[PDB]
């Protein structure tokens, strides 16, 4: 658990530092320096928007790959004694990849809303552009993380389904319903991302 120890140490140190820093800023009357407004505002909307698109695609692909390996290991292991698994349970892989297809679709939809400003002063950048960056970032987070979780869930369920099919052929047809239910979550994330970026306009 060396790497987990390192991560836990970093987390604890960072958040102890944050606690003491917040106590200092509040108590020493230096709160006006902790300008979250200035952070969110000076930080360019392009950073948020492009991080959002990148996350939308990358996390969707991460979930698709996670599920694909989770279920393909089981498919190939079971098929050593019952090769029909390879031909039948490719549907789990298909779902895990539909996750990434949703990811790219939403990356396209988000990227279609990008446009330069030609301004640097926040009053010039305006609510429209700032909210556009924030909402593209949020939509990317939504789609990417929902797709990641849906892909992992479908992969786990598909590994289970492949293992169960390796022993009795008539079970996969009934266990695919769990895969469908797990797939619905990616669709929900896509719908929410689309709603978020519905009225988004950079320029």
């Amino acid at each position: 658990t060396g790497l987990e120890l390192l991560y836990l140490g970093i987390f604890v140190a960072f958040w102890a530092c944050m606690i003491v820093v917040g106590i200092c800023y509040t108590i020493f009357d230096l709160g006006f320096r902790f300008d979250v407004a200035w952070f969110l505002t000076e930080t360019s909307p392009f950073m948020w928007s492009n991080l959002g698109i990148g996350l939308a695609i990358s996390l969707s692909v991460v979930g698709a790959a996670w599920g694909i390996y989770i279920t393909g290991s089981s498919i190939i292991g079971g098929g050593v004694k019952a090769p029909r698994i390879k031909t039948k349970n490719l549907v789990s892989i298909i779902f895990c990849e539909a996750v990434a297809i949703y990811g790219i679709i939403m990356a396209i939809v988000i990227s279609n809303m990008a446009e330069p400003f030609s301004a640097t002063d926040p009053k010039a950048i305006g609510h429209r552009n700032y909210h556009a960056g924030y909402s593209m970032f949020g939509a990317g987070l939504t789609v990417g993380l929902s797709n990641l979780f849906c892909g992992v869930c479908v992969g786990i369920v598909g590994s289970g389904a492949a293992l169960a099919d390796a022993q009795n052929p008539s079970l996969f047809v009934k266990i695919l319903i769990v895969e469908i239910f797990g797939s619905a979550i990616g669709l929900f994330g896509v719908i929410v991302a689309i709603l978020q970026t519905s009225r988004v306009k950079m320029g």
Binding site: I101, I180, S183, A184, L187
Partner: peptide, 25 residues
């Protein structure tokens, strides 16, 4: 034997599958 509940569940699964499949395909 005819099981109405199971038939309804099967048709619901088929309809959900086809409708989500249109979009996903």
């Amino acid at each position: 034997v005819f099981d109405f509940g199971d038939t309804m569940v099967h048709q619901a699964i088929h309809t959900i599958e086809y409708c989500l499949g249109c979009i996903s395909n």
